[PDB]
Amino acid sequence: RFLCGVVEGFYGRPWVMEQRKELFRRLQKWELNTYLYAPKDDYKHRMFWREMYSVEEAEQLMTLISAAREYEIEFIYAISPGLDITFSNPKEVSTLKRKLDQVSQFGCRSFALLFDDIDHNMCAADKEVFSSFAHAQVSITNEIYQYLGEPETFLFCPTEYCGTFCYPNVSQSPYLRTVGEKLLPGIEVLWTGPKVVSKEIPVESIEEVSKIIKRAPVIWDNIHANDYDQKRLFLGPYKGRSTELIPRLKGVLTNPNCEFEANYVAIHTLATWYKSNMNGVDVLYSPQMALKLALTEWLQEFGVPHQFVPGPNEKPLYTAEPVTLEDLQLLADLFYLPYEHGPKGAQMLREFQWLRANSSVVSSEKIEEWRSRAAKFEEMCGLVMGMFTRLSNCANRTILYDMYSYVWDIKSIMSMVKSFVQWLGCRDQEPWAFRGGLAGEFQRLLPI
Amino acid sequence: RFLCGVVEGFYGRPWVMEQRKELFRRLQKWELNTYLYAPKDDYKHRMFWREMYSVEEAEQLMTLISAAREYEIEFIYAISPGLDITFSNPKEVSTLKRKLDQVSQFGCRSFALLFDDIDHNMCAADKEVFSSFAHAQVSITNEIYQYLGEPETFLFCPTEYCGTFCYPNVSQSPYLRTVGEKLLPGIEVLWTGPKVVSKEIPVESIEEVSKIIKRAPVIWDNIHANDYDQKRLFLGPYKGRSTELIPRLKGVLTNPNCEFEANYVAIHTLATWYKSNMNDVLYSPQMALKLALTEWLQEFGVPHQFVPGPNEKPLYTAEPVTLEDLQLLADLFYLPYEHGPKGAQMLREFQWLRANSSVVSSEKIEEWRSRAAKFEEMCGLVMGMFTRLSNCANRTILYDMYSYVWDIKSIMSMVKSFVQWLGCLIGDQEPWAFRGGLAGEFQRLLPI
Ligand SMILES: CNC(=O)C[C@@H]1[C@H](O)[C@H](O)[C@@H](CO)N1CCCc1cccc(C(F)(F)F)c1
Numbered sequence: 057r058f059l060c061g062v063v064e065g066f067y068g069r070p071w072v073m074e075q076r077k078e079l080f081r082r083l084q085k086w087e088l089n090t091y092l093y094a095p096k097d098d099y100k101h102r103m104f105w106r107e108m109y110s111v112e113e114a115e116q117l118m119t120l121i122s123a124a125r126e127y128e129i130e131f132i133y134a135i136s137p138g139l140d141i142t143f144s145n146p147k148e149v150s151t152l153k154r155k156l157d158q159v160s161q162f163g164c165r166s167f168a169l170l171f172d173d174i175d176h177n178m179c180a181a182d183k184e185v186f187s188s189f190a191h192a193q194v195s196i197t198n199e200i201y202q203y204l205g206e207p208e209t210f211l212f213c214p215t216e217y218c219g220t221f222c223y224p225n226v227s228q229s230p231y232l233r234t235v236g237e238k239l240l241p242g243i244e245v246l247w248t249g250p251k252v253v254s255k256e257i258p259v260e261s262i263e264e265v266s267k268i269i270k271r272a273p274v275i276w277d278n279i280h281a282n283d284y285d286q287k288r289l290f291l292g293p294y295k296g297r298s299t300e301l302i303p304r305l306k307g308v309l310t311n312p313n314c315e316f317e318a319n320y321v322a323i324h325t326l327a328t329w330y331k332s333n334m335n336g337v338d339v340l341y342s343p344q345m346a347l348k349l350a351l352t353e354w355l356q357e358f359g360v361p362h363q364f365v366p367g368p369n370e371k372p373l374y375t376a377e378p379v380t381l382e383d384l385q386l387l388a389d390l391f392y393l394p395y396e397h398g399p400k401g402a403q404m405l406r407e408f409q410w411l412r413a414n415s416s417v418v419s420s421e422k423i424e425e426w427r428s429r430a431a432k433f434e435e436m437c438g439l440v441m442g443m444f445t446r447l448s449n450c451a452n453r454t455i456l457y458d459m460y461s462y463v464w465d466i467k468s469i470m471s472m473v474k475s476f477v478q479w480l481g482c483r484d485q486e487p488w489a490f491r492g493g494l495a496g497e498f499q500r501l502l503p504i
Numbered sequence: 505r506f507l508c509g510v511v512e513g514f515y516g517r518p519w520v521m522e523q524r525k526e527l528f529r530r531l532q533k534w535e536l537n538t539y540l541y542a543p544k545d546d547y548k549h550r551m552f553w554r555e556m557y558s559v560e561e562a563e564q565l566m567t568l569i570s571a572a573r574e575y576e577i578e579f580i581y582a583i584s585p586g587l588d589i590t591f592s593n594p595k596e597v598s599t600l601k602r603k604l605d606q607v608s609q610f611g612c613r614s615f616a617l618l619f620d621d622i623d624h625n626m627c628a629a630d631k632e633v634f635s636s637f638a639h640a641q642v643s644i645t646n647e648i649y650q651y652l653g654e655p656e657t658f659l660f661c662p663t664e665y666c667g668t669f670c671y672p673n674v675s676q677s678p679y680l681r682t683v684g685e686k687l688l689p690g691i692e693v694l695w696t697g698p699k700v701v702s703k704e705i706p707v708e709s710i711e712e713v714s715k716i717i718k719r720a721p722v723i724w725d726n727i728h729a730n731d732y733d734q735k736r737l738f739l740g741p742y743k744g745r746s747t748e749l750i751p752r753l754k755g756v757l758t759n760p761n762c763e764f765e766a767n768y769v770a771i772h773t774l775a776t777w778y779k780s781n782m783n784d785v786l787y788s789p790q791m792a793l794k795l796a797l798t799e800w801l802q803e804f805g806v807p808h809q810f811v812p813g814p815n816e817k818p819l820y821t822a823e824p825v826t827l828e829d830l831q832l833l834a835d836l837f838y839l840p841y842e843h844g845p846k847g848a849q850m851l852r853e854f855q856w857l858r859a860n861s862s863v864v865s866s867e868k869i870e871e872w873r874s875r876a877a878k879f880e881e882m883c884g885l886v887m888g889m890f891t892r893l894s895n896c897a898n899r900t901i902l903y904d905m906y907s908y909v910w911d912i913k914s915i916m917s918m919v920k921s922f923v924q925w926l927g928c929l930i931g932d933q934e935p936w937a938f939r940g941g942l943a944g945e946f947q948r949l950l951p952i
Pocket residue numbers: 065066067172173213217248252276278281282283284285311914936
């Protein structure tokens with residue numbers, strides 16, 4: 057019994073109810089089974105975790121939970137009390153119980169307590185009752201778990217939730233040792249890999265952590281998360297996790313891009329990865345082949361919402377060409393993965409670096425190498441503009457709007473790069489010449 | 505009788521109906537009077553300008569237009585056919601007429617044709633009928649204007665809509681000469697100033713253009729527009745346009761930030777500017793900023809107990825957003841050509857600390873250490889500002905701004921960390937160490 061699906065676990069604008077219901081439909085379509093509710097900035101999840109839902113909010117969560125059951129998706133309600141809970145005040149424990157039991161009255165049977173992204177310092181009153189921060193967390197987690205009747209799925213996100221967050225390392229951490237020893241065995245533990253955003257999650261890294269927590273973890277995967285950098289988006293395939301992990305894990309829940317419609321590839325390729333070795337103990341999963349599968353399917357959504365035919369001498373329709381598979385392949389390569397651009401992106405960057413570095417050669421056989429390489433690069437910059445133009449004319453406006461900022465940025469920068477290469481081949485600005493804000497001026501003075 | 509208010513004239517996710525109705529309420533509250541509907545990417549405004557609204561869309565626009573009349577705001581319906589229109593095909597002219605009279609059946613009496621951001625090249629069939637691009641535009645604009653019964657308010661956005669777009673200059677442009685001579689005198693002309701995003705709009709610049717278009721223009725002001733750069737936001741005051749312009753103009757319509765709630769200052773300060781010389785000693789941008797910010801503050805504590813003892817964990821959520829937080833925020837995201845005083849101050853202090861950092865390893869040491877600690881205090885104010893914003897009751901305002909405030913606090917946190925390191929950073933890093941994506945790698949190779 058493996059929990060595979062999506063955690064809405066990110067910072068910023070959460071997903072709205074309509075989007076979550078649509079998520080459930082996609083999860084089911086792709087034979088995934090789990091959703092973990094945890095939006096960092098949905099006010100009653102974390103900041104105001106004490107506050108009960110209103111009659112309005114109650115009705116909406118009930119409707120959502122019913123939608124999950126209807127789509128055969130396990131609904132997991134997480135709460136994040138760690139910013140300000142006095143762990144040793146039993147009214148505080150009661151308040152936490154009240155909150156979770158209100159949600160259980162909405163039909164929810166699966167739960168989670170999360171202690172990610174809080175500092176390790178307890179108040180004086182908690183230091184006198186518990187000998188460490190982990191003891192304090194494990195005590196209320198155990199007490200809540202049993203208060204709810206030992207539900208079949210209950211998750212715990214540790215504060216040391218990845219290799220690099222473990223002081224002094226994974227295998228000797230007194231925080232994780234305590235979690236492994238004291239956290240009740242029915243409770244599952246979340247883990248993001250060697251890092252917050254793990255490039256790879258090697259099998260031996262999971263053998264290491266499994267030993268100290270004394271269970272196989274559930275992965276909380278940040279591979280496609282994009283809340284940490286305003287300019288980033290990830291449309292590359294699920295990658296860097298061997299299918300051999302599946303037998304050594306209780307699940308994988310991916311925490312993907314903030315922009316809902318940008319997660320077609322992220323979730324589709326996750327599903328393809330899970331399905332490839334669902335009952336494992338000869339290569340089963342190819343990230344490229346999976347990207348192509350995801351993109352081919354995604355394409356069909358662009359021509360669906362969410363005449364005049366001009367003669368030979370007349371102005372041809374601006375709107376005539378639909379988005380192509382090749383446009384989406386290019387787009388994904390430009391906004392690929394946190395540690396890697398896709399082949400076409402890396403190729404354009406390499407060609408531009410070369411054209412810039414050999415540009416003195418204008419002013420030999422080397423000139424026609426430069427001019428032919430430049431014209432081929434301009435062709436590629438043209439494909440980026442073409443991709444933007446056809447996206448901006450697509451019938452699915454909802455997908456367009458989620459992606460707009462990103463595609464506009466890349467096309468806009470490729471247009472400056474193209475223009476710059478043309479200028480190299482020929483020997484009071486608007487504000488978009490000088491980009492990034494104040495933020496960007498600070499950033500440019502830091503080491504890169 | 506002066507048109508002052510807002511044009512929704514930008515690229516990307518348009519505003520939804522609820523937000524537009526809320527705009528009308530604010531415009532009225534601040535004694536502004538005009539809204540110009542022109543979202544570049546609302547599909548039936550520009551790309552698919554030929555397509556009639558559905559029953560659903562019709563009902564929504566009717567409701568919106570009624571809301572405008574109810575709030576004493578003139579509603580102006582713009583359409584942008586320039587990407588695609590064969591100007592000489594009378595079916596095309598008929599299609600345009602059909603579209604506009606559908607909108608007039610929704611209750612709308614004011615209209616606009618826009619030819620901004622299209623190229624100057626006509627199809628063969630239009631070249632045989634019209635001797636220039638301006639003749640073609642002026643011909644259908646005049647024909648539509650009279651077909652609608654010469655409505656009291658009808659606007660025209662030229663293709664050469666600012667000083668720098670005029671070939672070869674404003675006073676000798678054969679495009680604008682033709683517009684001035686041939687465009688019917690009842691029709692108003694839109695103008696963005698010397699530039700697309702005009703730092704200043706000098707009086708003599710408007711005297712220059714007024715002479716050649718043969719009327720006073722309506723300014724389409726892009727001062728606070730932020731669609732051109734994904735990282736930018738503008739919360740500084742309306743600035744750089746003398747109150748002496750008002751007698752020489754038919755109006756000012758501001759095209760502000762994409763994020764609806766970020767436009768409290770942009771629109772409020774515009775209103776204060778207009779009201780100051782309705783019929784520069786009269787308008788102070790700083791005093792106006794302060795007025796706007798003080799008023800805006802009241803919105804943060806309104807949606808759209810437990811008391812811990814001396815030894816217990818204090819509430820994370822206790823401190824509300826302050827006026828000083830919003831003053832700091834505005835100074836960090838101020839104006840397209842200028843940061844606010846606190847922003848410029850932090851940048852200056854960081855440049856100094858970086859450039860004199862060798863001094864660690866004299867009186868100069870204690871100058872460095874005292875300046876550094878004072879800079880860390882200021883970086884802490886940025887984090888404080890973020891944390892208190894993220895706890896505010898108006899979630900709608902928070903979410904519109906989230907990306908920006910998160911970015912600035914995130915970068916100030918790296919800058920703070922970097923100054924601390926200088927007073928005492930790579931290896932296997934998380935992705936947010938290296939910011940900006942593919943786009944950012946291209947940008948860093950362009951000249952700065
Ligand atoms: C399992 N729990 C987590 O991974 C916690 C969080 C969120 O879930 C988030 O979606 C995900 C990926 O971003 N995590 C980032 C943590 C590092 C961080 C914190 C604050 C600020 C930054 C920043 F400096 F990068 F902005 C990073």
